[PDB]
Design an enzyme around this catalytic site. Structure first.
Site, mmCIF file in Angstrom:
data_model
loop_
_atom_site.group_PDB
_atom_site.id
_atom_site.type_symbol
_atom_site.label_atom_id
_atom_site.label_comp_id
_atom_site.label_asym_id
_atom_site.label_seq_id
_atom_site.Cartn_x
_atom_site.Cartn_y
_atom_site.Cartn_z
ATOM 1 N N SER A 18 -4.990 -23.510 -6.630
ATOM 2 C CA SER A 18 -6.327 -23.891 -6.156
ATOM 3 C C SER A 18 -6.863 -25.214 -6.735
ATOM 4 C CB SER A 18 -7.339 -22.758 -6.309
ATOM 5 O OG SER A 18 -7.198 -21.822 -5.238
ATOM 6 N N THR A 65 -10.065 -14.690 -8.091
ATOM 7 C CA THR A 65 -8.821 -14.033 -7.795
ATOM 8 C C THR A 65 -8.629 -12.770 -8.581
ATOM 9 O OG1 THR A 65 -6.499 -14.273 -7.330
ATOM 10 C CG2 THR A 65 -7.329 -15.305 -9.331
ATOM 11 N N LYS A 69 -12.134 -9.619 -7.723
ATOM 12 C CA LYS A 69 -12.774 -9.776 -6.396
ATOM 13 C C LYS A 69 -13.844 -8.735 -6.039
ATOM 14 C CE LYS A 69 -8.896 -12.319 -4.360
ATOM 15 N NZ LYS A 69 -8.094 -12.368 -3.107
ATOM 16 N N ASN A 90 -14.417 -13.617 -2.914
ATOM 17 C CA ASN A 90 -13.483 -14.565 -3.502
ATOM 18 C C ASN A 90 -14.081 -15.988 -3.584
ATOM 19 O OD1 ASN A 90 -13.374 -15.570 -0.866
ATOM 20 N ND2 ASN A 90 -11.251 -16.214 -1.126
ATOM 21 N N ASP A 105 -10.879 -14.816 2.320
ATOM 22 C CA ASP A 105 -9.585 -14.133 2.469
ATOM 23 C C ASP A 105 -9.433 -13.570 3.868
ATOM 24 O OD1 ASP A 105 -8.511 -14.467 -0.036
ATOM 25 O OD2 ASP A 105 -9.482 -12.653 -0.837
ATOM 26 N N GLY A 122 -1.547 -1.485 -1.716
ATOM 27 C CA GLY A 122 -2.586 -2.007 -2.591
ATOM 28 C C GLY A 122 -3.968 -1.564 -2.175
ATOM 29 N N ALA A 123 -4.912 -1.709 -3.106
ATOM 30 C CA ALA A 123 -6.271 -1.231 -2.898
ATOM 31 C C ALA A 123 -7.331 -2.157 -3.502
ATOM 32 C CB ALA A 123 -6.434 0.199 -3.461
ATOM 33 N N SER A 126 -8.053 -8.154 -2.225
ATOM 34 C CA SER A 126 -7.288 -8.734 -1.129
ATOM 35 C C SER A 126 -6.986 -7.682 -0.063
ATOM 36 C CB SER A 126 -6.003 -9.389 -1.648
ATOM 37 O OG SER A 126 -6.304 -10.530 -2.472
ATOM 38 N N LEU A 200 1.230 -11.452 -0.292
ATOM 39 C CA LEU A 200 0.116 -12.364 -0.637
ATOM 40 C C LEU A 200 0.401 -13.364 -1.772
ATOM 41 C CD1 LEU A 200 -1.438 -10.288 1.176
ATOM 42 C CD2 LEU A 200 -3.396 -11.070 -0.062
HETATM 43 O O1 LIG Z 1 -5.937 -19.750 -6.486
HETATM 44 C C1 LIG Z 1 -5.509 -18.575 -6.111
HETATM 45 O O2 LIG Z 1 -4.276 -18.219 -6.462
HETATM 46 C C2 LIG Z 1 -6.456 -17.634 -5.410
HETATM 47 C C3 LIG Z 1 -5.796 -16.646 -4.501
HETATM 48 C C4 LIG Z 1 -6.623 -15.847 -3.784
HETATM 49 O O3 LIG Z 1 -6.309 -14.565 -3.605
HETATM 50 C C5 LIG Z 1 -7.890 -16.430 -3.197
HETATM 51 O O4 LIG Z 1 -8.771 -15.396 -2.797
HETATM 52 C C6 LIG Z 1 -8.653 -17.247 -4.239
HETATM 53 O O5 LIG Z 1 -9.859 -17.847 -3.669
HETATM 54 C C7 LIG Z 1 -7.688 -18.298 -4.756
#
Ligand SMILES: O=C(O)[C@@H]1C=C(O)[C@@H](O)[C@H](O)C1
Length: 255
Positions: A18, A65, A69, A90, A105, A122-123, A126, A200
Site C-alpha cells: 500500500s 488490514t 477490519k 478498511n 474491499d 474465513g470469517a 475480508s 486474497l
Molecule cells: O496493504 C494491504 O496489504 C491491505 C490489504 C487489504 O486487505 C486492504 O483492505 C487494505 O486497505 C490494504
C-alpha cells in the site's frame, strides 16, 4: 502548501505494498490535491485502539488490514457506504473532525473478478465484505470456518454456514483466512470441480494457490483486488477529487 499524513494499520505490516502505490499517487497528483501526501506502514499492537492511534498520529486518512477490519468498524464515529453492510472497515478518513469508515474491499473485489455460487474460507473483515458483495450479485454463498464466530453476520446475509466442509461443488473457492487452510484432499476435490481458486494474499505464492496450480485449477491471487481497493480508498483520500480509475492506472504501472 501543506503536509498530510496517511498510512496502513496492520499486524503484521512489513510486506504491505500500500505505501508503494499510494506514495506514487500522492506524488503524481500533488498539484490537483494541493497538498504533500505521504503514506506509512504502521504496525499496530494487537491491544491497541485504532481510533486513538489514528488521532494521536494526526493522520488525514488510512487503510486497515489484518487483523483490524471489524474493530475499525466498531470504533469509527461514523460509517458510510457499503461498509454499513460489510461489518468491516478498511478505509478511514477524517471528515468534519470525525473518524469516518468506508469499505473498498467489496467493490475492489468485484472489480478484480473477470459463477453461480461460492465457498469462502474465513470469517474476518475480508471474508465479510466478499460475502456481502457476492450475495449482492445473486450468487449462492457458503462460508466455512473452524469455530462459530461471525455466524450471525453471515446468516443474516443469507449465507449457508458450515464447520464441516460441505460435500458440494462450488464455482469460486475463496481463501479469505489468515499451511493449507483445509485438509489437502478436501481442498483437492473442491479444486477438481471448481472454476476459480481465489486467494486474497498477494506478493507471495500461498500453499492454497500452489495446490490449485498443481491441479490445473484456474487461480487468482490478491494483486488486482489490492490495486482496485487501494485506488478506491485513494479517491476517498482526495476528498473525492481524483476518480478511482485515474488512481488505478498510476497504481498498476508502479507495481
Ligand atoms: O496493504 C494491504 O496489504 C491491505 C490489504 C487489504 O486487505 C486492504 O483492505 C487494505 O486497505 C490494504
Amino acid at each position: 502548501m501543506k503536509l498530510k499524513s496517511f498510512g496502513v494499520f496492520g499486524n503484521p505490516i512489513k510486506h504491505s505494498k500500500s505505501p508503494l502505490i499510494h506514495n506514487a499517487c500522492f506524488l503524481t497528483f500533488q498539484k490537483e490535491l494541493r497538498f504533500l501526501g505521504h503514506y506509512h506502514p504502521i504496525l499496530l499492537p494487537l491491544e491497541s485502539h485504532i481510533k486513538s492511534e489514528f488521532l494521536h498520529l494526526g493522520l488525514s486518512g488510512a487503510n486497515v488490514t489484518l487483523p483490524f477490519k471489524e474493530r475499525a468498524f466498531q470504533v469509527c464515529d461514523k460509517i458510510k457506504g457499503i461498509a454499513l453492510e460489510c461489518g468491516a472497515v478498511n478505509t478511514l478518513v477524517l471528515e468534519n473532525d470525525e473518524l469516518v469508515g468506508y469499505n473498498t474491499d467489496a467493490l475492489g473485489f468485484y472489480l478484480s473478478l473477470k459463477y453461480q455460487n461460492a465457498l469462502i474460507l474465513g470469517a474476518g473483515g475480508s471474508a465479510k465484505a466478499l460475502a456481502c458483495e457476492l450475495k449482492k450479485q445473486g450468487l449462492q454463498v457458503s462460508v466455512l470456518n473452524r469455530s462459530s464466530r461471525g455466524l450471525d453476520f453471515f446468516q443474516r446475509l443469507g449465507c449457508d454456514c458450515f464447520m464441516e466442509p460441505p460435500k458440494s461443488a462450488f464455482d469460486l473457492i475463496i481463501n479469505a483466512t489468515s499451511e493449507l487452510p483445509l485438509n489437502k484432499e478436501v481442498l483437492k476435490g473442491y479444486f477438481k470441480e471448481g472454476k476459480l481458486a481465489y486467494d486474497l494474499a498477494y506478493g507471495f505464492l500461498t500453499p492454497f494457490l500452489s495446490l490449485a496450480k498443481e491441479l490445473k485449477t484456474p487461480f487468482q491471487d490478491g494483486k488486482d483486488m489490492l490495486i482496485y481497493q487501494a485506488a478506491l480508498s485513494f479517491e476517498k483520500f482526495s476528498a473525492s477529487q481524483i476518480p478511482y480509475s485515474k488512481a488505478f492506472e498510476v497504481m498498476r504501472s508502479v507495481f
